[PDB]
């Protein structure tokens, strides 16, 4: 009694929410068995971290 | 960016194991010669030492840089009360042991993620197979892979108390070893050998070939006697110090004979649970490098 | 260079009285605007009163 309004009008709602300005890093969840972060870091060679 | 010319770093004045008494600092050579002992019949037999395991632990991702060095001496011959160290930062080592990796090891003690400015550091090559050997350190306490801590004290006290007309057949009387001594004795050698740079030891053994493995082996047998002494003591079952007329020996128990708590207390070196488990994955795994 | 679409239930059976068939119903049926479980819920409700 509820699959409907949810599989449709909210449906197309993170249908293009997907695509805004601010959201960028891919939090993808499609295969559990193989995913992860590859996280990316700011580092100098005088020594930052 | 210091090099071995096949020497070792240990061919080097930069960092030299030496123990102070005798009111001026002398070498690891002059003080052995103090260790006088007689026999109480237990017949200490050598037996054999079970390979180690290749698995490596994972380094987990940890950011910022730990004291690597720090650590290995800290719990073997570290004197003030160490408490639970089971757990802890004990394997970012394996994190060198992969081909083309940028983690250096500096001099020192430390091990950075990434080579920093001004900072001197062993060669990147060397290196790694110093690391395929004690970064399997890290499982020390991982049940199912802890080494045995009774059996590899029977090496140990064939090594620093066993006169080679013994060794040559395996088998050895259990000894009472007493040196003469001053004030704080067994509490300021521990003090002493903790600062000594062991990191610029273990690299050696791992790298020099046949050639200088044969005249390693010759000069530094006495370096390994020595930090090998002090281990020793916070295990023996007692540590009461006869007397002469003005005199004072310190008369050791029973080295080479594993027991289960120390003889100091308060007078020499102590152990803990956590550390015996690590003790005999140490002298495990370097017996069968130096030997 | 295969096109995916859907099925029928109306097609792969047609027993006696246990699923409805014809074509004057199966035409009929090829007309309202795609029920869910609450559009014919109140169909089973307008046709009471």
Redesign the interface.
């Known amino acids: 009694?509820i699959?409907?309004?949810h599989t449709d009008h909210l449906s197309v709602v993170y249908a293009t929410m997907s695509n805004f300005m601010l959201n960028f890093t891919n939090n993808f969840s499609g295969n559990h068995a193989t995913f992860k972060p590859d996280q990316y870091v700011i580092?100098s060679?005088?020594?930052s971290? | 960016m210091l090099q071995q010319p096949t020497g070792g770093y240990t061919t080097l004045e930069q960092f030299a194991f030496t123990i102070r008494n005798d009111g001026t600092n002398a070498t690891p050579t002059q003080f052995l010669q103090l260790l006088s002992y007689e026999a109480t019949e237990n017949e200490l037999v050598k037996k054999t030492i079970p390979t180690p395991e290749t698995h490596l632990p994972s380094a987990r991702n940890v950011?910022?840089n730990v004291y690597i060095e720090d650590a290995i001496t800290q719990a073997l011959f570290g004197i003030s009360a160490q408490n639970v160290n089971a757990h802890g930062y004990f394997s970012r080592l394996s994190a060198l042991a992969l081909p083309n990796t940028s983690a250096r090891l500096g001099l020192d003690g430390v091990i950075y993620?990434?080579?920093?400015?001004n900072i001197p550091f062993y060669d990147p090559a060397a290196v790694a197979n110093f690391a395929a050997t004690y970064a399997k350190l890290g499982n020390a306490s991982t049940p199912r892979y802890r080494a045995d801590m009774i059996d590899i004290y029977a090496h140990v006290g064939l090594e620093l108390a066993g006169t080679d007309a013994e060794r040559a057949a395996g088998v050895m009387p259990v000894k009472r070893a007493k040196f003469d001594s001053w004030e704080g004795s067994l509490i300021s050698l521990s003090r002493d050998v903790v600062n000594w740079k062991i990191l610029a030891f273990l690299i050696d053994l791992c790298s020099l070939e046949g050639e200088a493995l044969r005249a390693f082996k010759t000069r530094n047998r006495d370096v390994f006697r020595m930090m090998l002494f002090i281990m020793s003591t916070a295990v023996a079952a007692n540590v009461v110090n006869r007397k002469v007329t003005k005199r004072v020996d310190r008369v050791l128990e029973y080295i080479g004979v594993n027991s289960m708590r120390t003889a100091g207390r308060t007078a020499t070196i102590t152990y803990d649970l956590s550390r015996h488990e690590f003790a005999a994955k140490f002298l495990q795994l370097t017996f069968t490098r130096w030997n | 260079r295969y096109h995916e679409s859907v099925l029928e239930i109306a097609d792969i059976f047609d027993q006696a009285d246990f699923i409805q068939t014809s074509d004057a119903v199966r035409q009929l049926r090829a007309l309202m605007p795609t029920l869910?479980?609450?559009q014919i819920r109140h169909a089973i409700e307008r046709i009471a009163q």
């Open positions: 009694n699959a409907v309004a580092t060679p005088e020594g971290y | 950011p910022g993620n990434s080579e920093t400015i | 869910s479980t609450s």
